[PDB]
Homo-oligomer: A and B are copies of this chain.
Amino acid sequence: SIKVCIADDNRELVSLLDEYISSQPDMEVIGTAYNGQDCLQMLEEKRPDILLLDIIMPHLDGLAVLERIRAGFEHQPNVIMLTAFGQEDVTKKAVELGASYFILKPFDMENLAHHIRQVYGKT
């Protein structure tokens, strides 16, 4: 059971991520946060294996959170930045500190091309 924590200030995205990760048979969601300060508070209690972290947030962004994780925590999760188009340059500083990243495209295409084939096939 891979234990995952989510921290992002887009409430719609956090909800989708929680649903998606919870549907995976080998993973579990053990906490969520909407800003950096609450993320750092969560990690002190839950010790997840994986943290999905928004790279840019007002006041305390994902790189400031990652720096605090590396400078003050004994137990650190593997951090995966959530990066949208145009945010790649800022993500690169976080990869220099050892995080990994996931390019988050705006709309979900899963199963579209399968559905298209099913429709086309029936005619």
Contact = CB atoms under 8 A, between A and B. Distances in A.
List the number of copies, as a whole number: 2
Interface stretch (A39-47, A55-63, A67-75, A113-121): A113-121
Contacts of A115: 80, 100, 102
Interface residues of A, number: 33
Contact of A49 (B16, B110, B120): B120
Interface in A73-123: 78, 80, 100, 102, 104-113, 115-117, 119-120, 123
Interface of A: 2, 4, 12-13, 16-17, 20-21, 24, 26-27, 49-50, 78, 80, 100, 102, 104-113, 115-117, 119-120, 123
